[PDB]
Amino acid sequence: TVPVALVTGAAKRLGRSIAEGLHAEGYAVCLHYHRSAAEANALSATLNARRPNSAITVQADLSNVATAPAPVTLFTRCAELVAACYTHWGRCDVLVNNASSFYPTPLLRREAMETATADLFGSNAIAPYFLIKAFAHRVAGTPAKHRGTNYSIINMVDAMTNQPLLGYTIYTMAKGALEGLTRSAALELAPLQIRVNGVGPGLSVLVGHRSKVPLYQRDSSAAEVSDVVIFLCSSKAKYITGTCVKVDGGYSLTRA
Amino acid sequence: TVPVALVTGAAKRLGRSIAEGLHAEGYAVCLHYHRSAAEANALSATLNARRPNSAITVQADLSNVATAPVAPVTLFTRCAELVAACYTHWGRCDVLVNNASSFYPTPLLRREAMETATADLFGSNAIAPYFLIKAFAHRVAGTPAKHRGTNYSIINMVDAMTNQPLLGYTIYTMAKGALEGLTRSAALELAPLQIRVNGVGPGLSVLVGHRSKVPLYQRDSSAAEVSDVVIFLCSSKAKYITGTCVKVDGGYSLTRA
Amino acid sequence: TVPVALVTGAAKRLGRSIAEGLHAEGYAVCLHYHRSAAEANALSATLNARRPNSAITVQADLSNVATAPAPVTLFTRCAELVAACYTHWGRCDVLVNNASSFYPTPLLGDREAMETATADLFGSNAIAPYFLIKAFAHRVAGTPAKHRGTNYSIINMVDAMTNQPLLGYTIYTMAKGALEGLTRSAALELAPLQIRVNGVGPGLSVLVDDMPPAVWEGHRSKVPLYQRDSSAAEVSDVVIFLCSSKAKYITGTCVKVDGGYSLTRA
Amino acid sequence: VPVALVTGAAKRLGRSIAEGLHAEGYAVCLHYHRSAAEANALSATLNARRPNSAITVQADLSNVATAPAPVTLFTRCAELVAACYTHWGRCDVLVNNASSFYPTPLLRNGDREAMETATADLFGSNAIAPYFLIKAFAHRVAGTPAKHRGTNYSIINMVDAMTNQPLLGYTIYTMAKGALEGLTRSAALELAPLQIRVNGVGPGLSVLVDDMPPAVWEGHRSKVPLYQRDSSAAEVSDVVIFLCSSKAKYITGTCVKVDGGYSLTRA
Ligand SMILES: NC(=O)c1ccc[n+]([C@@H]2O[C@H](COP(=O)([O-])OP(=O)(O)OC[C@H]3O[C@@H](n4cnc5c(N)ncnc54)[C@H](OP(=O)(O)O)[C@@H]3O)[C@@H](O)[C@H]2O)c1
Ligand SMILES: NC(=O)c1ccc[n+]([C@@H]2O[C@H](COP(=O)([O-])OP(=O)(O)OC[C@H]3O[C@@H](n4cnc5c(N)ncnc54)[C@H](OP(=O)(O)O)[C@@H]3O)[C@@H](O)[C@H]2O)c1
Ligand SMILES: NC(=O)c1ccc[n+]([C@@H]2O[C@H](COP(=O)([O-])OP(=O)(O)OC[C@H]3O[C@@H](n4cnc5c(N)ncnc54)[C@H](OP(=O)(O)O)[C@@H]3O)[C@@H](O)[C@H]2O)c1
Ligand SMILES: NC(=O)c1ccc[n+]([C@@H]2O[C@H](COP(=O)([O-])OP(=O)(O)OC[C@H]3O[C@@H](n4cnc5c(N)ncnc54)[C@H](OP(=O)(O)O)[C@@H]3O)[C@@H](O)[C@H]2O)c1
Ligand SMILES: C[C@H](O)[C@H](O)[C@H]1CNc2nc(N)[nH]c(=O)c2N1
Ligand SMILES: C[C@H](O)[C@H](O)[C@H]1CNc2nc(N)[nH]c(=O)c2N1
Ligand SMILES: C[C@H](O)[C@H](O)[C@H]1CNc2nc(N)[nH]c(=O)c2N1
Ligand SMILES: C[C@H](O)[C@H](O)[C@H]1CNc2nc(N)[nH]c(=O)c2N1
């Protein structure tokens, strides 16, 4: 049986490493992207060349706004992502909510606050919520005998949000909501055997900071984070649910 | 000097107790409300009868949506207008208590009812408090240092039990999680202005059963049992506390199924 | 109608401030001390001059070791502290586990060093508070309900910063973690007796300054709120509040009093 | 061939941890206190599958002095780590799994020896011994020339996912696990320069002891949201093995719950 993984923001960096890792374990991967069409398509080509029909790409703005084709809502866009997996392969075993906007929203210095609120909250929290809902709906609608044996949802949280990055309030708030989603979905979906966990990087694949990380005095590589994601999705982690695992080299143990 | 407190959702229950307690300590109180006009106005009459010009009421839907003029009005604007009402009337705003909150189910397992739920639950519990804190801070920043108050305090009403989620209340739980994040982020960012930001998280308070599950007293709490903690955090005796959430839950979060 | 408070390590700094604040609220205070007899006795004199028979002092090494009189165990010494309140005033309403040893135990005539550090650091910060709470609770349980006080409150002095460990203080950090557990465990088990158990965790308070000024100033400057360590009152007022009847629904919780220091990262 | 030292390795989780590390290629030093027969049988099985891949060492990890000047807990702990170096010339992984667990009620409704031994036993096995073991483990790595050091040092502390929602009447045990969490963070920070990772794994309900009426047993496991059952030993041990693998080399100072969502419940 070939399981299917939907990974949002899979075009590069961590999402790509997650997609690659899942692919190496035998998963067919649906690579979501927003603006990185070229990178998403190149990654799909590479995976499909290794194993035919093992990758596809889907475009979607995960910001909490309506888009043009009656306007299309974020929920619809989200359901369409999950549906794309079912239409193409007939299944969706894993969902990795990785796509994320990250930029300042200083409390102390228009409609710029409007798009920021919708973009930061949508990608990091509201979209994951709808995606999880669509994912669960498809599992519930599948007759028990036909269901997969290892449903796993991973939310990409942030090991450092409890020690907030100055000026990033909305982003920090959204990761906070993502943690809540992880616990609430883990509890509510347990009866369907759908595990919901979080993985929270500290500093990874930086585009100074490095020297502050206790372990190795550097930010992590993409694999150092993605291997943890892959492990949580494996059958060896079947009793883990509702938990967030930090992958930060001891950074959250530091103080100013 | 008579300090001013803005309390959202002040018409009844915890909010009213918070408004009353602050009032008893000498604060002039701006009582925010959404649909409880009668209650808000009655509370205002009581406080003003006790001490003239010590209370006012301001209406606002804190849901993350555009309303119609009384161009559409955004939640930010409505939030800035709440803080501005304090400055216009009394020339100051020392304390902000983000208490207003919608709470109802959003089950993952069973269309336009989803969009209003998202905007309502997230707006009242998280987005509105963000904009309110922003407006509050901007007013403080724009005040010349020599004229600023000596005890700025913002309290976010969180929830002691959200880490042990109520089945079927996902959006609400997520919003409180966001509110916790706002508490920490605002406490860090606003420290230079000496604006403290803390949280108070009830377990079971003034239930309209679960009661017997509370380790301490085997009952839900009274409004005062929660409001007194809020008032204390607002006091100069709590001036070194910031970015922390205090549970007022009688040990309920220490339980397991 | 005068309540009694037992405060360990009450001779100076935070403990003194806690004892003074409880005294100002009308409590009679049993001031525990280990090595600071002179300071403890002076504090007692002050309090008793303000209000006769409102203060006493008891000496006790709270390290997890047997002392000389069969040898006396820590538990016995602990029970003896609580008993001292009952013998003198017939009651014990509040217990503040404040006494605490704090020095390095780096991981990277010597057997005596590691052996006494473990007992001292763990005893003062965790084992003694455990036995003191046990003693305190037994006295409440053995009191007929009609005579019991209406506001029993135990406060454990934790540390807002132990989750971001101070390099080289492992045993101390371990003991404070044990103290957090004691707070939650005692809060749950003692709820039926209406004995509230809470923690107060300072960040940097009345910071010891045996170091260059730039270094000392470097440390306080890291605190987001005020860029300074706190005063003793800034911590003690929170303790006093948690002990008051207005905090009677709060139990099993640890309150940070750190000016946002725990929100920082390197 | 890397070496793992696993305390309380004779049965249950420790056995499974020892077996899993063994299946990954580790030589395993199986520590035990009272389960000699079980430890030796486990060693026999491992050595039969791969010669010289297992040894056993006995030690009371309670915070008391033993019979030889009396022997201290620290010495006993240093001796465990040393036994790995003496036999195989290395110690790459340490799993602090041994743990005593029994009630210490605050209220009652010979005597002194039980209180004194409970404190030392519960605290020693769950916290003080792990401390001394980590210290011994670290001293050995520091004394090894960088050129001879292993490339994946990993320490795992077996914590408890449910201690924050205390088991009524288990105060000392709960206190010791809290200390263990502290040790995990403190050691992770201090040993980071030597590339020694220190993490925790905290079970919820695992291979639940069933010395009670079946319905009471069904009742407890049914409180667990995922699967409505306690976990298998492998379900916990596989997570330990994963954290010890090179795939987890950027993870340190973190405690991972393996509780099927139990800590998410409320009464
Ligand atoms: N790297 C780190 O040090 C770090 C630290 C802590 C947490 N994290 C978390 O780990 C995850 C991955 O980190 P990363 O650094 O790889 O992320 P990233 O490079 O910052 O962004 C990942 C992808 O998110 C997508 N995205 C952004 N806004 C979107 C929107 N409005 N709608 C749909 N997609 C959107 C983008 O896709 P397109 O390019 O196609 O437009 C982007 O490529 C994120 O959730 C992040 O919060 C990362
Ligand atoms: N009581 C508890 O057991 C409990 C437990 C945990 C946490 N809390 C938290 O403590 C706080 C107070 O609790 P409570 O029980 O007193 O609250 P509540 O009775 O449920 O509601 C408080 C007020 O919030 C206002 N509100 C709701 N939706 C709004 C919106 N869309 N826009 C503007 N205002 C809105 C309402 O004002 P109007 O009536 O004027 O329309 C309502 O009166 C809340 O934040 C709650 O989350 C309470
Ligand atoms: N100050 C801070 O920045 C800070 C930060 C975090 C937490 N805290 C916590 O707050 C509490 C009070 O802080 P502090 O700075 O005021 O404490 P402190 O000055 O360091 O010491 C408090 C007292 O504890 C007593 N003590 C130490 N070891 C003892 C033992 N073996 N047996 C009996 N008594 C012992 C000593 O009494 P004698 O002098 O009579 O011998 C000492 O005066 C402590 O629990 C501390 O851990 C303080
Ligand atoms: N099973 C669970 O549901 C559960 C839940 C939460 C956490 N945990 C943690 O996971 C770990 C393993 O759990 P488990 O249930 O497998 O443990 P266990 O069966 O209860 O005991 C493991 C071993 O610890 C050793 N031990 C006890 N006291 C000792 C002492 N004084 N000195 C030296 N060794 C001592 C014993 O070895 P000998 O038999 O040779 O004497 C015992 O077999 C423990 O740390 C436990 O706290 C388990
Ligand atoms: C620089 C920053 O602190 C850190 O490396 C993280 C924070 N969270 C992130 N989140 C997103 N979406 N993208 C990033 O690059 C990061 N970087
Ligand atoms: C009913 C629930 O158990 C609990 O009593 C709290 C949770 N959060 C709440 N939040 C709001 N806004 N209103 C409420 O009545 C409650 N009730
Ligand atoms: C020095 C350190 O950073 C911090 O201020 C605290 C930690 N805990 C303490 N605990 C005790 N007993 N005494 C102290 O002075 C302190 N100092
Ligand atoms: C019985 C309890 O609920 C839980 O399953 C755990 C707690 N910690 C434990 N610790 C040890 N050492 N052994 C055990 O069997 C357990 N069981």
Tab-separated table of N, CA, C and O in Angstrom, chain A residues 25 183 186-187 190-191 193-195 203 213-220 223-224 227-228 231 236-250 253-254, chain D residues 24 185 188-189 192-193 195-197 205 224-231 234-235 238-239 242 247-261 264-265:
chain	number	residue	atom	x	y	z
A	25	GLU	N	10.601	7.589	2.304
A	25	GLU	CA	10.007	6.521	3.090
A	25	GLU	C	8.927	5.791	2.285
A	25	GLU	O	8.307	4.862	2.772
A	183	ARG	N	-3.501	20.351	20.267
A	183	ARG	CA	-4.048	19.642	21.415
A	183	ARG	C	-5.525	19.343	21.225
A	183	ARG	O	-5.981	18.223	21.494
A	186	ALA	N	-5.911	16.703	18.488
A	186	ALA	CA	-5.452	15.406	18.975
A	186	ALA	C	-6.548	14.734	19.796
A	186	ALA	O	-6.857	13.553	19.599
A	187	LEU	N	-7.148	15.496	20.702
A	187	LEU	CA	-8.212	14.944	21.532
A	187	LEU	C	-9.453	14.558	20.717
A	187	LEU	O	-9.929	13.432	20.818
A	190	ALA	N	-8.835	11.476	18.123
A	190	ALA	CA	-8.329	10.217	18.690
A	190	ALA	C	-9.216	9.017	18.362
A	190	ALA	O	-8.689	7.941	18.063
A	191	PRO	N	-10.544	9.171	18.451
A	191	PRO	CA	-11.451	8.067	18.093
A	191	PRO	C	-11.266	7.573	16.646
A	191	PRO	O	-11.569	6.414	16.387
A	193	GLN	N	-8.383	7.455	15.287
A	193	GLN	CA	-6.979	7.064	15.251
A	193	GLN	C	-6.134	8.024	14.409
A	193	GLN	O	-5.189	7.601	13.736
A	194	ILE	N	-6.508	9.303	14.415
A	194	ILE	CA	-5.736	10.312	13.712
A	194	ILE	C	-4.891	11.002	14.772
A	194	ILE	O	-5.429	11.609	15.705
A	195	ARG	N	-3.579	10.870	14.641
A	195	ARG	CA	-2.647	11.479	15.559
A	195	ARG	C	-2.327	12.907	15.123
A	195	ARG	O	-2.112	13.185	13.933
A	203	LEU	N	16.138	27.603	15.485
A	203	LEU	CA	16.745	28.280	14.344
A	203	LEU	C	17.134	27.192	13.336
A	203	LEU	O	17.924	26.285	13.657
A	213	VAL	N	23.167	29.277	19.951
A	213	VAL	CA	22.589	27.953	20.129
A	213	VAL	C	23.549	27.055	20.898
A	213	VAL	O	24.658	26.790	20.439
A	214	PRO	N	23.117	26.575	22.063
A	214	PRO	CA	23.984	25.761	22.920
A	214	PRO	C	24.565	24.578	22.185
A	214	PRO	O	25.760	24.376	22.265
A	215	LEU	N	23.730	23.823	21.480
A	215	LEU	CA	24.199	22.655	20.766
A	215	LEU	C	24.726	23.034	19.382
A	215	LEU	O	23.967	23.500	18.515
A	216	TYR	N	26.031	22.821	19.219
A	216	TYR	CA	26.760	23.071	17.981
A	216	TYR	C	27.005	24.537	17.642
A	216	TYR	O	27.753	24.819	16.708
A	217	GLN	N	26.397	25.466	18.379
A	217	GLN	CA	26.550	26.890	18.085
A	217	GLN	C	26.220	27.176	16.621
A	217	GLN	O	26.920	27.928	15.938
A	218	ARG	N	25.128	26.585	16.143
A	218	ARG	CA	24.665	26.837	14.785
A	218	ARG	C	23.173	26.543	14.657
A	218	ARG	O	22.586	25.861	15.496
A	219	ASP	N	22.564	27.085	13.610
A	219	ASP	CA	21.181	26.771	13.296
A	219	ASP	C	21.204	25.356	12.728
A	219	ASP	O	22.254	24.829	12.333
A	220	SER	N	20.043	24.731	12.672
A	220	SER	CA	19.989	23.376	12.160
A	220	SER	C	19.880	23.292	10.640
A	220	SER	O	19.583	24.273	9.955
A	223	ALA	N	17.230	18.652	7.219
A	223	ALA	CA	17.066	17.248	7.590
A	223	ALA	C	16.934	17.061	9.110
A	223	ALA	O	16.143	16.234	9.587
A	224	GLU	N	17.700	17.844	9.860
A	224	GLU	CA	17.676	17.764	11.316
A	224	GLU	C	16.279	18.015	11.867
A	224	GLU	O	15.943	17.543	12.948
A	227	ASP	N	13.680	14.960	9.727
A	227	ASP	CA	13.751	13.572	10.209
A	227	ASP	C	12.849	13.356	11.421
A	227	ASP	O	12.371	12.253	11.656
A	228	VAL	N	12.614	14.410	12.185
A	228	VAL	CA	11.773	14.302	13.367
A	228	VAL	C	10.316	14.219	12.934
A	228	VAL	O	9.520	13.461	13.508
A	231	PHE	N	9.748	10.822	11.598
A	231	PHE	CA	9.630	9.856	12.676
A	231	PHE	C	8.236	9.912	13.292
A	231	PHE	O	7.625	8.888	13.507
A	236	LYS	N	6.170	3.695	14.331
A	236	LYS	CA	6.877	3.589	15.600
A	236	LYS	C	6.431	4.666	16.583
A	236	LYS	O	6.620	4.513	17.785
A	237	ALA	N	5.809	5.731	16.088
A	237	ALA	CA	5.312	6.811	16.938
A	237	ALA	C	3.782	6.767	17.094
A	237	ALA	O	3.167	7.794	17.399
A	238	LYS	N	3.178	5.588	16.924
A	238	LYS	CA	1.723	5.458	16.995
A	238	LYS	C	1.025	5.759	18.316
A	238	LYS	O	-0.200	5.874	18.337
A	239	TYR	N	1.778	5.862	19.407
A	239	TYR	CA	1.178	6.169	20.693
A	239	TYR	C	1.374	7.652	21.059
A	239	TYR	O	0.903	8.116	22.105
A	240	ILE	N	2.080	8.385	20.203
A	240	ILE	CA	2.305	9.805	20.430
A	240	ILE	C	1.220	10.656	19.783
A	240	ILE	O	0.964	10.545	18.588
A	241	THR	N	0.579	11.503	20.575
A	241	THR	CA	-0.424	12.402	20.049
A	241	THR	C	-0.630	13.585	20.966
A	241	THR	O	-0.502	13.473	22.184
A	242	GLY	N	-0.916	14.733	20.374
A	242	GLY	CA	-1.133	15.932	21.157
A	242	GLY	C	0.124	16.545	21.735
A	242	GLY	O	0.029	17.433	22.572
A	243	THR	N	1.297	16.111	21.288
A	243	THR	CA	2.537	16.641	21.845
A	243	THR	C	3.351	17.420	20.813
A	243	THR	O	3.288	17.118	19.613
A	244	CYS	N	4.086	18.422	21.291
A	244	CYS	CA	4.942	19.243	20.446
A	244	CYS	C	6.378	18.919	20.827
A	244	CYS	O	6.751	18.961	22.005
A	245	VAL	N	7.183	18.580	19.834
A	245	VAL	CA	8.574	18.249	20.074
A	245	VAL	C	9.479	19.394	19.616
A	245	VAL	O	9.428	19.790	18.447
A	246	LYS	N	10.283	19.947	20.528
A	246	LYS	CA	11.247	20.985	20.149
A	246	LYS	C	12.464	20.356	19.455
A	246	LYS	O	12.958	19.307	19.856
A	247	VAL	N	12.914	20.996	18.384
A	247	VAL	CA	14.101	20.592	17.643
A	247	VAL	C	14.864	21.911	17.529
A	247	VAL	O	14.916	22.529	16.467
A	248	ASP	N	15.477	22.315	18.638
A	248	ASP	CA	16.122	23.621	18.734
A	248	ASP	C	17.519	23.648	19.336
A	248	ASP	O	17.985	24.717	19.723
A	249	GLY	N	18.163	22.497	19.496
A	249	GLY	CA	19.504	22.489	20.054
A	249	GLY	C	19.680	23.169	21.406
A	249	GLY	O	20.755	23.689	21.713
A	250	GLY	N	18.642	23.162	22.234
A	250	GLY	CA	18.744	23.781	23.541
A	250	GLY	C	18.572	25.295	23.553
A	250	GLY	O	18.758	25.921	24.608
A	253	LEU	N	16.436	26.961	26.159
A	253	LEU	CA	16.932	26.840	27.525
A	253	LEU	C	17.749	28.067	27.889
A	253	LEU	O	18.219	28.178	29.023
A	254	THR	N	17.927	28.965	26.920
A	254	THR	CA	18.739	30.150	27.155
A	254	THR	C	17.931	31.312	27.689
A	254	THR	O	16.703	31.351	27.563
D	24	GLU	N	19.437	-2.226	17.073
D	24	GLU	CA	20.032	-1.162	16.275
D	24	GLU	C	21.551	-1.338	16.184
D	24	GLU	O	22.205	-0.602	15.469
D	185	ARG	N	17.068	19.455	31.638
D	185	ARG	CA	17.329	20.760	31.057
D	185	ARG	C	18.717	21.253	31.432
D	185	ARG	O	19.483	21.688	30.566
D	188	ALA	N	21.395	19.195	29.691
D	188	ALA	CA	21.436	19.476	28.260
D	188	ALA	C	22.221	20.762	28.005
D	188	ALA	O	23.070	20.824	27.112
D	189	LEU	N	21.992	21.767	28.845
D	189	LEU	CA	22.682	23.036	28.653
D	189	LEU	C	24.172	22.946	28.979
D	189	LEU	O	24.994	23.407	28.210
D	192	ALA	N	26.117	20.483	26.379
D	192	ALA	CA	26.048	20.831	24.973
D	192	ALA	C	27.428	21.026	24.337
D	192	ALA	O	27.610	20.627	23.205
D	193	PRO	N	28.394	21.647	25.016
D	193	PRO	CA	29.739	21.807	24.421
D	193	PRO	C	30.445	20.479	24.105
D	193	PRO	O	31.343	20.457	23.264
D	195	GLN	N	28.831	17.942	23.033
D	195	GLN	CA	27.914	17.307	22.094
D	195	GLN	C	27.186	16.119	22.690
D	195	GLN	O	26.876	15.167	21.990
D	196	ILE	N	26.913	16.191	23.989
D	196	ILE	CA	26.180	15.133	24.666
D	196	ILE	C	24.769	15.673	24.751
D	196	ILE	O	24.544	16.721	25.362
D	197	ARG	N	23.829	14.990	24.109
D	197	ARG	CA	22.443	15.424	24.128
D	197	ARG	C	21.747	14.802	25.334
D	197	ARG	O	22.031	13.656	25.696
D	205	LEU	N	0.458	5.860	30.343
D	205	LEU	CA	0.144	4.562	30.933
D	205	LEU	C	0.779	3.528	30.028
D	205	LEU	O	0.422	3.437	28.848
D	224	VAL	N	-7.644	6.766	28.448
D	224	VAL	CA	-6.688	7.217	27.441
D	224	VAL	C	-7.366	7.469	26.101
D	224	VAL	O	-7.842	6.530	25.465
D	225	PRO	N	-7.353	8.716	25.639
D	225	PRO	CA	-8.027	9.076	24.382
D	225	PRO	C	-7.570	8.264	23.163
D	225	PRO	O	-8.431	7.767	22.441
D	226	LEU	N	-6.271	8.151	22.894
D	226	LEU	CA	-5.862	7.341	21.747
D	226	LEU	C	-5.900	5.831	22.073
D	226	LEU	O	-5.207	5.367	22.982
D	227	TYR	N	-6.755	5.088	21.368
D	227	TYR	CA	-6.897	3.632	21.522
D	227	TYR	C	-7.584	3.142	22.789
D	227	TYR	O	-7.888	1.964	22.903
D	228	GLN	N	-7.837	4.027	23.744
D	228	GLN	CA	-8.470	3.620	25.004
D	228	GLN	C	-7.724	2.450	25.639
D	228	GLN	O	-8.334	1.469	26.077
D	229	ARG	N	-6.402	2.564	25.675
D	229	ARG	CA	-5.559	1.541	26.287
D	229	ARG	C	-4.190	2.108	26.638
D	229	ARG	O	-3.750	3.135	26.102
D	230	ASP	N	-3.536	1.435	27.577
D	230	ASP	CA	-2.179	1.761	27.950
D	230	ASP	C	-1.338	1.309	26.757
D	230	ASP	O	-1.810	0.560	25.882
D	231	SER	N	-0.100	1.782	26.701
D	231	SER	CA	0.773	1.438	25.588
D	231	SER	C	1.544	0.133	25.799
D	231	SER	O	1.564	-0.435	26.903
D	234	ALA	N	7.180	-1.493	23.408
D	234	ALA	CA	7.783	-1.032	22.154
D	234	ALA	C	7.330	0.384	21.779
D	234	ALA	O	8.129	1.177	21.290
D	235	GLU	N	6.050	0.680	22.007
D	235	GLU	CA	5.480	2.001	21.742
D	235	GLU	C	6.225	3.129	22.480
D	235	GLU	O	6.250	4.267	22.027
D	238	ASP	N	10.590	2.513	21.202
D	238	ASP	CA	10.942	3.009	19.868
D	238	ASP	C	11.248	4.516	19.874
D	238	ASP	O	12.086	4.968	19.103
D	239	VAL	N	10.573	5.290	20.728
D	239	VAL	CA	10.789	6.734	20.828
D	239	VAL	C	12.155	7.003	21.453
D	239	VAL	O	12.875	7.895	21.015
D	242	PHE	N	14.688	6.253	18.831
D	242	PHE	CA	14.736	7.357	17.890
D	242	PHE	C	15.535	8.548	18.420
D	242	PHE	O	16.341	9.108	17.693
D	247	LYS	N	19.579	10.708	13.696
D	247	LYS	CA	18.514	11.486	13.092
D	247	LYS	C	17.952	12.498	14.096
D	247	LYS	O	17.346	13.503	13.716
D	248	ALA	N	18.222	12.281	15.376
D	248	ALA	CA	17.759	13.209	16.399
D	248	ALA	C	18.871	14.081	16.995
D	248	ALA	O	18.678	14.672	18.048
D	249	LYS	N	20.009	14.200	16.312
D	249	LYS	CA	21.151	14.963	16.826
D	249	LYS	C	21.001	16.468	17.099
D	249	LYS	O	21.900	17.058	17.683
D	250	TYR	N	19.921	17.102	16.643
D	250	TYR	CA	19.709	18.517	16.935
D	250	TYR	C	18.709	18.665	18.087
D	250	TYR	O	18.424	19.790	18.525
D	251	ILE	N	18.154	17.539	18.546
D	251	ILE	CA	17.214	17.578	19.666
D	251	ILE	C	17.953	17.465	20.982
D	251	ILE	O	18.732	16.516	21.185
D	252	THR	N	17.731	18.436	21.863
D	252	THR	CA	18.308	18.379	23.208
D	252	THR	C	17.544	19.224	24.239
D	252	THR	O	16.967	20.253	23.911
D	253	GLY	N	17.503	18.771	25.483
D	253	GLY	CA	16.801	19.491	26.532
D	253	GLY	C	15.286	19.418	26.440
D	253	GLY	O	14.595	20.198	27.073
D	254	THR	N	14.764	18.465	25.679
D	254	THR	CA	13.330	18.361	25.510
D	254	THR	C	12.788	17.041	26.033
D	254	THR	O	13.483	16.023	25.993
D	255	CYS	N	11.564	17.084	26.554
D	255	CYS	CA	10.882	15.894	27.062
D	255	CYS	C	9.745	15.556	26.107
D	255	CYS	O	8.919	16.403	25.821
D	256	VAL	N	9.720	14.331	25.598
D	256	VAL	CA	8.686	13.906	24.666
D	256	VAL	C	7.656	13.024	25.371
D	256	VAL	O	8.007	12.010	25.983
D	257	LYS	N	6.391	13.416	25.298
D	257	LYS	CA	5.308	12.624	25.862
D	257	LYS	C	4.968	11.467	24.919
D	257	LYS	O	4.919	11.639	23.693
D	258	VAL	N	4.725	10.293	25.495
D	258	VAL	CA	4.311	9.106	24.745
D	258	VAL	C	3.147	8.592	25.582
D	258	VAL	O	3.254	7.574	26.279
D	259	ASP	N	2.030	9.311	25.510
D	259	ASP	CA	0.890	9.029	26.368
D	259	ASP	C	-0.476	8.924	25.713
D	259	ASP	O	-1.494	8.970	26.424
D	260	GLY	N	-0.523	8.866	24.383
D	260	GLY	CA	-1.796	8.753	23.689
D	260	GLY	C	-2.807	9.838	24.029
D	260	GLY	O	-4.022	9.598	23.976
D	261	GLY	N	-2.324	11.023	24.402
D	261	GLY	CA	-3.214	12.126	24.680
D	261	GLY	C	-3.791	12.165	26.080
D	261	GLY	O	-4.655	12.996	26.353
D	264	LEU	N	-3.995	15.374	28.044
D	264	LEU	CA	-4.938	16.342	27.531
D	264	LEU	C	-6.279	16.196	28.224
D	264	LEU	O	-7.154	17.029	28.007
D	265	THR	N	-6.442	15.163	29.051
D	265	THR	CA	-7.715	14.987	29.754
D	265	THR	C	-7.836	15.809	31.012
D	265	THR	O	-6.843	16.297	31.550
